[PDB]
Amino acid sequence: APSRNGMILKPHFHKDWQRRVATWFNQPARKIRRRKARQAKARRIAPRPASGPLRPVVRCPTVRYHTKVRAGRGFSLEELRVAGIHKKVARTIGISVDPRRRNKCTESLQANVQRLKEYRSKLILFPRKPSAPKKGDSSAEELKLATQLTGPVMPIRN
Amino acid sequence: MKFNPFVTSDRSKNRKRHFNAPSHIRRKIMSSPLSKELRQKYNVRSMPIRKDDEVQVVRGHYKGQQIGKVVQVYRKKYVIYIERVQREKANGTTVHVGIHPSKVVITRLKLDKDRKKILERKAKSRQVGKEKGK
Amino acid sequence: SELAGHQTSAESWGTGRAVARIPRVRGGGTHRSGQGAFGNMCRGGRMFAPTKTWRRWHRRVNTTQKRYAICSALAASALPALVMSKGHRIEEVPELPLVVEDKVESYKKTKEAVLLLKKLKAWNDIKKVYASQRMRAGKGKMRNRRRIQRRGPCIIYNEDNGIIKAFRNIPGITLLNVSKLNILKLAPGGHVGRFCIWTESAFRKLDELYGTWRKAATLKSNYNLPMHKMLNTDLSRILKSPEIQRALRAPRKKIHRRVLKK
RNA sequence: CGCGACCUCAGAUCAGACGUGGCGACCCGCUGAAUUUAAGCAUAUUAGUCAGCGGAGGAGAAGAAACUAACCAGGAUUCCCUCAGUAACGGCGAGUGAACAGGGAAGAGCCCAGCGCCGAAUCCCCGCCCCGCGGCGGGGCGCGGGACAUGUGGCGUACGGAAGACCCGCUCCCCGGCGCCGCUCGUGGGGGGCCCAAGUCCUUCUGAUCGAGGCCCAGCCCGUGGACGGUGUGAGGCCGGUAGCGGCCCCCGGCGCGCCGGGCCCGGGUCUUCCCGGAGUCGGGUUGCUUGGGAAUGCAGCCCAAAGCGGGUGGUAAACUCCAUCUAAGGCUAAAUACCGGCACGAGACCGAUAGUCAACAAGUACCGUAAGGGAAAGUUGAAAAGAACUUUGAAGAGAGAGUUCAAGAGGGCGUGAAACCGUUAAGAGGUAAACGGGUGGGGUCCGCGCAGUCCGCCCGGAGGAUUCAACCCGGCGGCGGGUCCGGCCGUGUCGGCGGCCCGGCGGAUCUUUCCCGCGCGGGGGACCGUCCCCCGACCGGCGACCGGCCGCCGCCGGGCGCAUUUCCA
RNA sequence: UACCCACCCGACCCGUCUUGAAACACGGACCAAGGAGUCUAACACGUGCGCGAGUCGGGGGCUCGCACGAAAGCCGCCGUGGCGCAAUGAAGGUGAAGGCCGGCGCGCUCGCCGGCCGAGGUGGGAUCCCGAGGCCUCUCCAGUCCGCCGAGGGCGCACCACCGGCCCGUCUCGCCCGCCGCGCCGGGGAGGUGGAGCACGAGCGCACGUGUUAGGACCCGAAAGAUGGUGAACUAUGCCUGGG
RNA sequence: GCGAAAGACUAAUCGAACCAUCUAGUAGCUGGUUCCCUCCGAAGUUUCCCUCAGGAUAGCUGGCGCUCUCGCACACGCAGU
RNA sequence: CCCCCGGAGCCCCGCGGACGCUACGCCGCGACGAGUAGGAGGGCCGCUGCGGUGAGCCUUGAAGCCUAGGGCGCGGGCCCGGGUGGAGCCGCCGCAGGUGCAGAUCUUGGUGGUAGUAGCAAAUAUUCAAACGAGAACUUUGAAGGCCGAAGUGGAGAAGGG
RNA sequence: CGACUCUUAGCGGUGGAUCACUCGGCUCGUGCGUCGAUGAAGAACGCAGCUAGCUGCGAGAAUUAAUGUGAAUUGCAGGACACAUUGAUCAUCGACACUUCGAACGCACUUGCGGCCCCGGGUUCCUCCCGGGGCUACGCCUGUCUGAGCGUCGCU
Ligand SMILES: [Mg+2]
Ligand SMILES: [Mg+2]
Ligand SMILES: [Mg+2]
Ligand SMILES: [Mg+2]
Ligand SMILES: [Mg+2]
Ligand SMILES: [Mg+2]
Ligand SMILES: [Mg+2]
Ligand SMILES: [Mg+2]
Ligand SMILES: [Mg+2]
Ligand SMILES: [Mg+2]
Ligand SMILES: [Mg+2]
Ligand SMILES: [Mg+2]
Ligand SMILES: [Mg+2]
Ligand SMILES: [Mg+2]
Ligand SMILES: [Mg+2]
Ligand SMILES: [Mg+2]
Ligand SMILES: [Mg+2]
Ligand SMILES: [Mg+2]
Ligand SMILES: [Mg+2]
Ligand SMILES: [Mg+2]
Ligand SMILES: [Mg+2]
Ligand SMILES: [Mg+2]
Ligand SMILES: [Mg+2]
Ligand SMILES: [Mg+2]
Ligand SMILES: [Mg+2]
Ligand SMILES: [Mg+2]
Ligand SMILES: [Mg+2]
Ligand SMILES: [Mg+2]
Ligand SMILES: [Mg+2]
Ligand SMILES: [Mg+2]
Ligand SMILES: [Mg+2]
Ligand SMILES: [Mg+2]
Ligand SMILES: [Mg+2]
Ligand SMILES: [Mg+2]
Ligand SMILES: [Mg+2]
Ligand SMILES: [Mg+2]
Ligand SMILES: [Mg+2]
Ligand SMILES: [Mg+2]
Ligand SMILES: [Mg+2]
Ligand SMILES: [Mg+2]
Ligand SMILES: [Mg+2]
Ligand SMILES: [Mg+2]
Ligand SMILES: [Mg+2]
Ligand SMILES: [Mg+2]
Ligand SMILES: [Mg+2]
Ligand SMILES: [Mg+2]
Ligand SMILES: [Mg+2]
């Protein structure tokens, strides 16, 4: 029974809500279950970017988010045979590989190739064995670091 | 303040851990201090009371200075009986009166193979921590 | 429970058997037969509107609101009138914004922490706290809230270098890190002005923690102290300055008892 | 009229395995209402919900695009915030009602068939030995079987692949054991066992205290321990415990080196020759349920029923027409995600015996119903039974004495012991039922008194008796206020120093890439402005923000003052 | 004042629905304990507080085994996003400025070029400012200080009434256009009218109150409907087998 | 279901069993709705409604305010006249 | 000259201000006070719990209960006196509610008046003596009178009971 | 002062309120995430020196061995034990054991009937008979054996 100038108020409680109410008293304890995992995973893969593998630079689709730039799903294939990184190997050196990205432009290609050239340079490959062959960076730049990169590796700043 | 979670500190929960406590546990709970003389010689503060230890009553109506020997241990009634600790019933038939070990002092332990390794490992533990803090 | 007094299967045979029209328990050869269930009135039954779990338990405050609740909390930790008026037994303390050396961060035996609170003449607060021990009044006894006492002096420290181990046994003492201040412990009970004992390292950071007046916080993102609705908070001096006194109508204090009409 | 292959198909208490049932909070298939709402009601709504039924797991399902989009484009699934109560649906009413993008949690990708290549390169079960045996396996040896040519294994699967040619660069992992070395985060991984500070000190209460004063700093001691429980009250110290990178002993977990047994000749980039995709499916017609999906979102049944520059999608049917974007008809997959069942725990601004679960107890018990089902009531002696010996009356139940107790005015359904109601004692009343409101009077129980209640407090006057000062100076201490702002410290407004400016930083789409580092961009320096800090000088608010001297006054202490003073008392 | 008693006056038994209850209207023997406007969400206005053209708050994140912690603190996350900062049209879409002056197109109430001012005006308007004149002051006059009264005169907030103006939709009518294109192209004008509009802002968040709803919804109350189940030991028949 | 038929009977139940659930079904209709004091204080009329035991809107009511006025020798405004 | 209150001596004192000034305190004037439904305000009105605080109270006696005991408040209620009772409890400043009962043919439990009343009336029937026993109309034995009258109140079974 | 009645109070009953307790709930977190044809969940019947119920157990039955633990158990008995001893008791539990139903399994539900193997008595397999042990359910897989078919053939 309306009275004197309210709104129309279609509220959705006709169905049965009391049964399927989800209260959030887990909320602060879930903050902690995740925090241990986040930590226990970083201590498990000790020298490694804690954030995870490297993701590519990428533009947001619709015209309202035109001008932003994101961290994409994985570096594309067309990108990779420009920097000269085999597609199956990159999965093993912390490079997200997305075999599903149609490259339409050279602008976003080179901009995104640069991160892969940049990754190589500041990448330290612990060699396969202690006494191991080429492409494993020397022992000088092996003692220098055990540093997990807290936070995203090379964060994409708009 | 207690810190360790996985301990209770709950008014009714460890009242329940008491009067449902099995006989194996109830030994440690029915422990009574040792007299100043022994407490010097062994470096042991307290002991589970035994069947034939000697004892002085310290509190209660007939606290005194006479040294009786324990007779039995009502671990179910959770209280001990002593030597001349006794009252006269209506028919003259005397009964013992229970005494809680916490309200009694041991004056001469009844030694054993079992009891000695207890007194050693109690003392060795007491001076291990004093060496750890040192 | 969602099932309080709601697992009975009572029908309310009614209106012609002279009894009540209340849902009464079916059949049986017990007492609980023709009794009355699903009623707030009746034995068994349920309550009115069973307390449900999704009551809005938790509350909210604006960020700046609960920041500026700490400024007024701290500013009143000075001003011994406000402090003593909370019954914090500060009569021998050498100065009210009591600063201590940063040796205190490294004490590791309650003996030293007890010795410090004597030389600063802060014992008397724990002394008071020591005397306020007793049993709570109500049914709170049989729910793990048995004993109660006053609050003691709070101690603030910039780094836990062992100090919280020292001042841990002394009752009433709470430890508050500077970078993590807490209205619920600086101003217990929504009253203002509790005793605080700052260490030197923490006393420096305070202006860099949340700001002086003509400078940013530089540890919080964007925050500065609140301004004043008025500066000269005293008006006894305002009201007898020559500026005000000069421009005043002269008083009227010849209280005119009413005249009886003859 | 025989014997022999194979194809179909039987029988075995044949050799070896495996399935059923239970639980059911969460999960996955299907089935599927009506109360209700619309103020009637049939569409709608309740609601793809309850019940029904099937099936699982420690999570399930989903999942590697026949996607989203229209952008300078994104990139498996699941969850959270958001989109948004919005696009749409609807007797366009009641009501219903998504997604995309963006942020975040997490983040992992992969296999077949086919087309082909390879001497079936394969797999299973037997029998002997070698190791291993409480998740039955590896190693070898056998004309010991059998499956398989109606198709097993290796490469390979669309992100391309194979095969070739030549371009470049040089080769450890896997598993079965056998050991051994570091016990490997709650700050020694999981579990078990046993262990680790300090008063029963003085006095005093009391039935008994764990209480009240006291005790070398809130008293003694300990305090990395002051949580809790026990104990004849209210205990850090009496007892268990508590804290503690505290100790010790087993077991289990998991990771690290060695030995052995076996498996494995496994790359990377360039040019050419071919090689390709899942049919009674897609799609269309139609009918029914479903979504919000509309000239049909999804699902079905029936009918029709494909294609190979094809097919699907591109959210109003249709033709023509261009673009975009995927690759269906086959399969596997951890992580965030859910848990009113179960094991094991922890906590609470919760309830406190008609409350809290039906259940604090022999409770899903007693009991009812043929049965499906229904389903209670009921906690407390004391601290210790010390639970009333004995004498006596009585057939006995019950008493009277006695005794135990701090208490039986705590006696076995016994703490406290209310009201209704009843019993008797005391007092007062009583023909208009009682009760009641206003007003007094009479009587009572007590209560205040008085064995005068004459209530006190100043000041003063008088008469008695007693101690020391006030008044005054002198010594000391301590204040107050004052101004000379006098000397110094302090801060407000202003000015000067351009002095901190780089020995002050932070901020800024300010400016320079003359710079530096890294790859036009990023980082760093240098220029600029706004802001915050040093030197000194001046004016002024000289501000409770002080310090020192000088002064004036006060007070206290100590001296001096001995009595027309100054106090006390009556 | 409260216990008992006495008297004089007054005086019908409460709850309830009701035009009307002491009612020959209904509930009520008595006494104990229990017992009824709750929570959530969504609006709305009022009020308090923080910040203010912004302001958050959530989810995340960074910090603990919580004792107090499942707290507090912090984060270009702080704006991804919501709400606000802008409307109006069904939609393609457009989108809040005028005034003035001078100069130039014929000032043509039309089009263009340089300068000034910038949210227009009228009437009330709390009201501040300016104030003629007074009113004394122990003398006659002189005269600077201090206020009181103060006719009259000015700025004029907030708000109200009105007239103007601008944005968008629609209409009418009419003019000149610009030209990367050609005008079934786009662009401007005058007058009226539709609008939840602008016309130098007031929101956001957090509390609390009141009210209205959706919720079991202030408590108790149907006759029913639906889904699954259990019954022929009574009784209704049929059958089988016995007995009278 | 069963009925030589009365809507009979179906475990004290029959014009449609009993049990549990959906379920706290719905009620414009009865009944109840818990401490004091202080201030203000109604309606039973209007139009519309499958409206006539109910609502919607009018009034009448209260609360909250605000804008001013000037009894501060110096008032405009209103009105059951 | 016509002087200074650290003193004019004060009915005005402007040099310093109440006892009074919890500044949401205190005070002086007037006016006015019916009330259902309803609204609003105030409640040192009350109930339970939490954060504070009361150097609160407490085995020299807390809660509750009981009181022809002394009183305060318009009242909600409150304070004291005694008594019994045997372990905890309240005041103030804030926060939170499952917060106040006469009533609902209310729920559960308890208890009255009715009332020592209705009632212990279907099938004809008992009596004497003894025994036992604390105790006999009612048991047991004896004696007498009687009924059931073999389609039984007699002698055996089924189902059911256990 | 007769009795009755009423009011009030003192005490006494009746009744169980209030109050104070609480080995119980409720709620919210956390870790784990554990059934069964080698016979589950559930049900029946048994089992203590004196034992009905709850609980604990399964003819080895108020427990068995084992390992920690280290002197009780208790209502009363009664006891072994040597408390210098697996050592009383409790906890753990990893050795062993598991009556009858129950998916329940030879066929049936009366508790009745069988079959097939074995080993005791009987027999001297002589068949019963008596006693004891192992099998005998449905569905399905792989393999194995014995087969059937005017199914396709081949050889004859
Ligand atoms: Mg991440
Ligand atoms: Mg209940
Ligand atoms: Mg199953
Ligand atoms: Mg309806
Ligand atoms: Mg209706
Ligand atoms: Mg209807
Ligand atoms: Mg319908
Ligand atoms: Mg539906
Ligand atoms: Mg279901
Ligand atoms: Mg799966
Ligand atoms: Mg799958
Ligand atoms: Mg997606
Ligand atoms: Mg919105
Ligand atoms: Mg729907
Ligand atoms: Mg092949
Ligand atoms: Mg100890
Ligand atoms: Mg203690
Ligand atoms: Mg205690
Ligand atoms: Mg399809
Ligand atoms: Mg539908
Ligand atoms: Mg279209
Ligand atoms: Mg697929
Ligand atoms: Mg009870
Ligand atoms: Mg009770
Ligand atoms: Mg109960
Ligand atoms: Mg009781
Ligand atoms: Mg009781
Ligand atoms: Mg007593
Ligand atoms: Mg008692
Ligand atoms: Mg009693
Ligand atoms: Mg009398
Ligand atoms: Mg009438
Ligand atoms: Mg009448
Ligand atoms: Mg009626
Ligand atoms: Mg119907
Ligand atoms: Mg009516
Ligand atoms: Mg009134
Ligand atoms: Mg209480
Ligand atoms: Mg007691
Ligand atoms: Mg409550
Ligand atoms: Mg009540
Ligand atoms: Mg006859
Ligand atoms: Mg017979
Ligand atoms: Mg009486
Ligand atoms: Mg009584
Ligand atoms: Mg009871
Ligand atoms: Mg054949």
Side-chain angles (χ1 to χ4, degrees):
Chain A
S3 295
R4 334 159 65 161
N5 227 349
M7 279 184 177
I8 272 315
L9 263 37
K10 321 281 234 303
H12 301 85
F13 292 115
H14 287 243
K15 186 165 298 196
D16 182 88
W17 55 275
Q18 300 215 224
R19 157 157 302 112
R20 304 165 303 260
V21 160
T23 52
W24 276 41
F25 311 118
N26 318 259
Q27 151 89 181
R30 191 154 59 193
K31 243 81 169 299
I32 290 170
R33 255 207 264 92
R34 292 152 180 271
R35 163 165 264 69
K36 295 184 190 300
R38 208 171 291 96
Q39 293 200 347
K41 188 189 179 181
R43 311 167 299 121
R44 150 217 256 189
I45 60 179
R48 225 88 60 116
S51 183
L54 176 60
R55 339 293 297 206
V57 147
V58 122
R59 288 204 173 284
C60 307
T62 55
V63 41
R64 101 122 109 179
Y65 288 129
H66 239 226
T67 72
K68 309 297 176 54
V69 179
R70 275 183 314 171
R73 196 265 198 299
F75 289 81
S76 72
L77 286 172
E78 213 257 22
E79 283 194 61
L80 286 167
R81 81 293 312 269
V82 147
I85 299 181
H86 182 276
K87 78 191 188 106
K88 293 192 183 174
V89 179
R91 298 265 18 253
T92 77
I93 321 178
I95 315 166
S96 315
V97 180
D98 167 86
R100 216 169 12 197
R101 244 180 62 218
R102 146 219 70 261
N103 281 254
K104 304 179 82 169
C105 43
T106 74
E107 269 96 3
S108 66
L109 185 66
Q110 262 68 292
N112 219 171
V113 158
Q114 247 69 341
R115 309 184 81 252
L116 273 169
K117 303 284 192 175
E118 215 292 328
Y119 195 31
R120 275 261 151 271
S121 58
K122 51 157 72 292
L123 183 134
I124 288 79
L125 205 85
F126 275 39
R128 272 238 65 171
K129 287 260 73 63
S131 325
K134 284 79 190 50
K135 308 186 74 63
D137 287 70
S138 63
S139 53
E141 5 171 281
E142 186 115 354
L143 205 74
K144 68 157 62 165
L145 88 171
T147 157
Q148 309 214 44
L149 252 58
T150 326
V153 41
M154 311 183 239
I156 298 164
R157 284 252 272 204
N158 238 321
Chain B
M1 268 307 298
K2 122 181 179 305
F3 293 151
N4 178 23
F6 291 82
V7 187
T8 316
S9 162
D10 190 71
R11 169 72 143 116
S12 67
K13 260 199 196 168
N14 41 348
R15 259 172 70 70
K16 164 106 160 296
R17 224 72 48 78
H18 213 136
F19 311 143
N20 268 317
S23 77
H24 136 79
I25 302 187
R26 250 162 183 166
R27 205 181 121 271
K28 288 169 212 59
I29 328 181
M30 296 192 76
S31 50
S32 69
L34 281 65
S35 57
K36 259 97 255 291
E37 175 208 349
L38 314 171
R39 208 172 72 167
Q40 198 79 19
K41 176 196 45 165
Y42 290 142
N43 206 353
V44 175
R45 174 59 106 103
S46 64
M47 274 305 296
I49 231 171
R50 204 243 183 72
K51 177 170 183 177
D52 46 359
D53 280 11
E54 283 57 30
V55 131
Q56 262 191 196
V57 190
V58 199
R59 331 248 88 173
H61 150 254
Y62 45 128
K63 106 273 294 307
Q65 220 87 113
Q66 315 80 313
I67 297 179
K69 188 194 58 170
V70 189
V71 182
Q72 44 148 115
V73 181
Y74 254 161
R75 282 205 237 247
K76 190 182 180 61
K77 267 197 186 61
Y78 190 44
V79 62
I80 88 171
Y81 287 177
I82 314 187
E83 187 112 54
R84 279 166 291 281
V85 160
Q86 64 199 207
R87 96 191 325 279
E88 196 181 36
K89 205 196 288 213
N91 0 330
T93 69
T94 41
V95 190
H96 296 352
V97 185
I99 305 207
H100 213 43
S102 57
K103 305 295 182 177
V104 117
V105 75
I106 284 174
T107 42
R108 215 210 328 173
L109 286 163
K110 200 265 184 166
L111 294 187
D112 255 327
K113 179 220 305 182
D114 306 342
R115 249 217 160 89
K116 283 168 190 303
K117 71 155 288 191
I118 278 196
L119 270 49
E120 278 196 89
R121 277 198 356 93
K122 276 203 170 188
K124 182 201 67 172
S125 183
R126 129 90 39 78
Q127 59 113 167
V128 146
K130 197 169 66 287
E131 283 293 328
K132 179 258 148 179
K134 174 184 179 298
Chain C
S1 95
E2 299 290 349
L3 301 320
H6 247 18
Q7 343 156 102
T8 317
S9 168
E11 206 259 329
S12 155
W13 84 79
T15 189
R17 321 248 303 97
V19 280
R21 288 142 69 109
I22 303 295
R24 289 148 177 295
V25 186
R26 213 69 115 301
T30 98
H31 312 255
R32 231 270 149 96
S33 57
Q35 294 272 56
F38 342 118
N40 39 100
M41 59 274 286
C42 30
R43 195 173 192 271
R46 67 266 152 288
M47 69 172 77
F48 184 21
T51 50
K52 268 104 152 66
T53 330
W54 54 84
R55 173 189 332 244
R56 184 165 70 99
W57 291 109
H58 311 252
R59 248 55 171 166
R60 311 283 332 290
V61 212
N62 296 293
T63 322
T64 44
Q65 279 225 334
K66 68 157 73 63
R67 271 170 184 170
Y68 159 41
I70 289 180
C71 309
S72 54
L74 279 210
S77 58
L79 293 53
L82 286 188
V83 162
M84 290 186 51
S85 187
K86 237 223 191 173
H88 260 73
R89 209 66 262 186
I90 286 178
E91 283 275 33
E92 247 303 309
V93 181
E95 95 184 322
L96 225 236
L98 174 62
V99 191
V100 201
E101 204 75 357
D102 15 321
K103 298 285 178 187
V104 183
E105 263 117 32
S106 197
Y107 288 157
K108 276 130 76 177
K109 290 255 177 152
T110 71
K111 209 118 296 176
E112 319 194 47
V114 163
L115 201 68
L116 176 86
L117 299 174
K118 301 175 229 174
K119 258 98 259 60
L120 314 179
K121 258 59 57 56
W123 231 165
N124 317 135
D125 307 331
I126 312 101
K127 188 185 312 308
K128 202 216 219 309
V129 158
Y130 252 157
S132 80
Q133 309 212 163
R134 70 281 227 224
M135 304 314 197
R136 204 185 293 267
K139 224 87 110 299
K141 268 176 293 65
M142 29 191 146
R143 336 176 171 162
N144 335 286
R145 298 188 305 270
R146 170 140 287 174
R147 299 143 92 282
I148 48 187
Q149 35 178 113
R150 283 314 157 255
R151 282 302 155 166
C154 183
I155 290 84
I156 283 92
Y157 65 111
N158 137 72
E159 73 290 31
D160 184 17
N161 207 167
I163 176 184
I164 79 131
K165 259 57 181 58
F167 301 74
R168 190 129 115 259
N169 248 353
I170 322 154
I173 270 67
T174 60
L175 273 311
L176 284 183
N177 187 336
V178 242
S179 27
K180 321 215 165 196
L181 279 165
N182 184 313
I183 319 89
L184 299 162
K185 303 187 180 173
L186 285 172
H191 305 254
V192 210
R194 162 173 162 168
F195 194 12
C196 275
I197 288 196
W198 310 86
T199 53
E200 174 250 42
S201 51
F203 202 54
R204 263 72 190 288
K205 231 167 149 287
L206 265 175
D207 57 63
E208 257 232 49
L209 252 183
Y210 55 143
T212 165
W213 251 305
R214 43 184 171 82
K215 208 183 60 53
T218 63
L219 246 13
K220 300 178 165 42
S221 52
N222 150 241
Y223 180 85
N224 287 87
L225 294 197
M227 247 99 280
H228 285 258
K229 205 175 305 306
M230 55 146 40
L231 299 201
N232 316 133
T233 45
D234 134 77
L235 63 94
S236 178
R237 188 121 141 68
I238 296 180
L239 286 193
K240 54 195 53 179
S241 61
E243 284 69 7
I244 286 202
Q245 283 274 331
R246 167 262 289 249
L248 284 184
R249 160 210 54 111
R252 268 191 291 279
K253 40 175 63 285
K254 200 227 198 170
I255 347 276
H256 276 124
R257 259 129 266 284
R258 88 111 163 283
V259 40
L260 161 69
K261 178 198 182 60
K262 330 179 149 189

